[PDB]
Every structure is written in structure tokens, then in C-alpha cells.
Amino acid sequence: NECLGTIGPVTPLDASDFALDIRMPGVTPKESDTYFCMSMRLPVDEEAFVIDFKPRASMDTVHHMLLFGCNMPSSTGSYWFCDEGTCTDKANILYAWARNAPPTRLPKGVGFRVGGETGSKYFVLQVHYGDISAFRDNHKDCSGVSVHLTRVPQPLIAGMYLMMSVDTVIPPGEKVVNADISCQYKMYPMHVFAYRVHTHHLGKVVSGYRVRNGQWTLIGRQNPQLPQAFYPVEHPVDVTFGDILAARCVFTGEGRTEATHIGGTSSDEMCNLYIMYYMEAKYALSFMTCTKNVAPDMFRTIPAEANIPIPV
Numbered sequence: 001n002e003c004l005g006t007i008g009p010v011t012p013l014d015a016s017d018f019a020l021d022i023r024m025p026g027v028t029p030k031e032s033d034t035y036f037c038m039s040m041r042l043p044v045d046e047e048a049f050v051i052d053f054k055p056r057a058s059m060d061t062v063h064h065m066l067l068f069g070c071n072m073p074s075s076t077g078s079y080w081f082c083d084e085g086t087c088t089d090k091a092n093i094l095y096a097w098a099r100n101a102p103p104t105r106l107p108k109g110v111g112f113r114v115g116g117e118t119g120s121k122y123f124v125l126q127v128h129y130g131d132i133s134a135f136r137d138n139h140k141d142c143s144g145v146s147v148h149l150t151r152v153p154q155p156l157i158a159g160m161y162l163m164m165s166v167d168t169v170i171p172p173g174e175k176v177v178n179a180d181i182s183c184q185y186k187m188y189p190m191h192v193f194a195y196r197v198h199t200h201h202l203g204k205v206v207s208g209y210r211v212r213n214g215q216w217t218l219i220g221r222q223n224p225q226l227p228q229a230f231y232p233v234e235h236p237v238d239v240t241f242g243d244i245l246a247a248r249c250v251f252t253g254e255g256r257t258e259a260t261h262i263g264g265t266s267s268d269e270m271c272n273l274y275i276m277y278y279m280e281a282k283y284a285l286s287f288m289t290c291t292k293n294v295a296p297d298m299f300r301t302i303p304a305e306a307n308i309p310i311p312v
């Protein structure tokens with residue numbers, strides 16, 4: 001149901017706006033925890049701005065959905081298993097829908113820039129099917145997300161700052177292993193408005209901070225075992241030239257018989273903190289990444305909550 005009909009995926013809205021429905025082409029999981037991927041090229045070649053997102057998920061099977069922007073989807077197929085990949089180039093996450101933690105809307109006047117000469121030419125949708133019981137009907141699922149695109153330039157441009165670990169090693173049975181990430185910020189000011197954390201089963205807590213003149217200001221702190229949606233920041237926080245962004249993921253090796261390193265399988269781990277921000281249009285860049293730990297010693301002053309499990 002809700003599947004793609006004779007009217008197609010593009011809904012005209014007015015002279016310069018249209019909604020684009022990005023849905024699975026009627027797929028059927030045959031195993032629980034199946035991750036399906038699919039892509040949609042933007043229908044317009046010129047620059048546009050994504051200013052809203054509306055989920056169209058099947059509450060009875062969809063565990064989570066992510067929408068990315070990129071220039072080279074990993075497969076040319078109708079849909080594929082995301083284990084093959086999302087995009088050959090580096091995908092930019094735009095939206096996350098997590099079952100049981102409703103998404104928050106973008107601030108008005110803020111939009112992601114896409115298309116054109118340097119923006120994403122494709123949207124890639126990942127849909128995680130958990131309970132494949134509802135598929136006893138062997139029916140087809142068309143879950144997805146609708147995006148509102150406009151040609152009208154937005155005064156604030158949303159972007160993503162991804163902090164991630166690449167060298168972490170978690171010895172088996174090890175009670176506590178910290179993965180620390182830190183970089184100095186050297187662009188125009190960005191204001192953080194939402195954040196998402198991601199780790200696999202060994203993750204206990206993930207926190208990120210802006211450090212200025214030695215003082216730590218919390219950006220976000222979350223239990224990665226909770227739904228991995230983008231959560232709004234408690235208080236708006238600017239990150240400016242000179243500041244240091246610092247994040248820590250706390251892992252345990254308990255329950256594993258061998259060491260766990262960074263990787264894409266359930267037996268591997270990941271330490272990600274996605275910081276969603278907006279910047280004035282004339283100063284904006286759409287994405288930044290930190291995969292290092294430039295000021296290792298700085299963590300001796302990280303707030304205690306960074307090591308404290310979040311109470312349910």
C-alpha cells in the first residue's frame with residue numbers, strides 16, 4: 001500500500017517548489033534485520049534546497065530509515081542490500097527516521113543545498129527492516145521519505161560535521177575502552193542544532209563537546225543503544241575558528257571472545273557523532289569530517305558525564 005502509482009514521485013507545489021517521494025520499489029525482506037538501499041537522481045540539474053522531510057514508514061516492520069545525498073550510488077540496480085554499500089563516493093547523511101523517537105523539523109530558513117555543480121546529484125535511501133513477520137503476506141513494501149525541494153535560496157545552509165574513529169581496538173572482556181576524537185575547527189562559525197550517535201552493540205555512551213579556552217561545552221550526549229535519530233541540541237551552540245571539537249565513545253569488550261576493531265559488521269564497532277549545523281549562506285560549507293585525535297591530552301579534563309552511562 002501507499003506504493004508508487006500512476007502519478008509518479010514528483011508533486012508540483014508552486015512555481016519553484018515540488019515534493020519528491022523516495023520509496024522502496026515494493027520489496028520483500030526474507031530475513032529479519034535486512035537493510036535495503038535504493039537511489040533517486042534529482043529530477044532537476046540546477047541547484048535546489050531541501051527544506052523539509054516527511055517519513056512514510058511501515059510502523060509494523062521498519063526499524064529505521066536514513067536518507068543520504070551523494071554523487072555515485074553503489075549500485076545501478078532497482079534496489080540492493082546495503083552491505084554492498086551506499087555510495088562509491090562519500091555519502092552525506094541528510095535525515096534519519098528512527099522507530100520510537102520522532103524526528104525534529106529543520107528550523108525555518110534552513111536548507112541543505114543539493115544538485116547544481118557541486119551538490120549531491122542523487123538521494124540514496126536506506127531502510128532497515130526489523131520484524132519481517134508482517135511479510136507473511138509476502139507483500140511488497142514501499143516505505144520511504146518525501147522531501148520538499150525549492151529553487152529559492154535559503155538564508156541558512158545546513159551541513160554535517162562527522163566525528164568518527166578509525167583505529168579503535170577493544171580487547172575482549174575489557175571493562176572500559178574510550179575512543180577519543182578531536183580536531184581544531186577552522187571555518188566560519190557553525191551553529192549546531194541536532195546530533196545523532198552511532199555505534200554497534202558494545203557502545204555505552206557517546207558525547208561530543210566544543211572546547212574553548214579550555215572550557216568544555218556539551219553539544220550532545222546519548223546512549224547509542226537508544227533509537228539513533230537526530231536529537232535536537234539542548235541549547236544552541238556555535239563552533240568558531242580556533243575551537244576544538246572533541247568526542248568520546250565509551251565501549252566495553254565484555255561478552256566478546258576476541259578483540260573488536262572498527263568495521264561494518266555486527267562483530268565490529270563504529271564510533272560516530274554526527275553534528276548537524278547551519279551556517280550563513282555566504283560562509284557555508286556542507287560537510288566536514290574529523291577522523292583524528294589532535295589533542296589527546298586534552299581529554300584529562302573531559303566532563304565526568306562523558307564516562308557516565310545514561311540512566312534509562
Ligand SMILES: CC(=O)N[C@@H](Cc1cc(I)c(O)c(I)c1)C(=O)N[C@@H](C(=O)O)[C@@H](C)O
Nearest residue numbers: 015016017018044045046047048149150151
Ligand atoms: C532546472 C530548471 O530549468 N528549472 C526551471 C524552474 C524550476 C527550478 C527548480 I530547482 C524548481 O524546484 C522548480 I518547482 C522550478 C527553470 O529554470 N525554468 C526556466 C524559467 O524559469 O523560465 C529557466 C529559464 O530558468
Ligand SMILES: CC(=O)N[C@@H](Cc1cc(I)c(O)c(I)c1)C(=O)N[C@@H](C(=O)O)[C@@H](C)O
Nearest residue numbers: 090091092093164165198262263270271272
Ligand atoms: C567506518 C565508520 O565509522 N562508518 C560510519 C560513518 C560514516 C558515515 C558516512 I554519511 C560516511 O559518508 C562515511 I565514509 C562514514 C557509518 O557507516 N555509519 C553508519 C551510520 O551512521 O548508521 C552509516 C549507515 O551511515
Ligand SMILES: CC(=O)N[C@@H](Cc1cc(I)c(O)c(I)c1)C(=O)N[C@@H](C(=O)O)[C@@H](C)O
Nearest residue numbers: 011013014017019020052053054146147148
Ligand atoms: C500540506 C503540506 O505537506 N505542505 C507542505 C508541502 C509538502 C507537500 C508534500 I505532498 C510533501 O510530501 C512535502 I515533504 C511537503 C508545505 O509546507 N509546503 C510549503 C509550500 O507550499 O511551499 C508551505 C509554505 O505551504
Ligand SMILES: [Cu+2]
Nearest residue numbers: 063064065128
Ligand atoms: Cu534500524
Ligand SMILES: [Cu+2]
Nearest residue numbers: 199200264270
Ligand atoms: Cu555502523
Ligand code: NI
Nearest residue numbers: 191236237238
Ligand atoms: Ni550564536
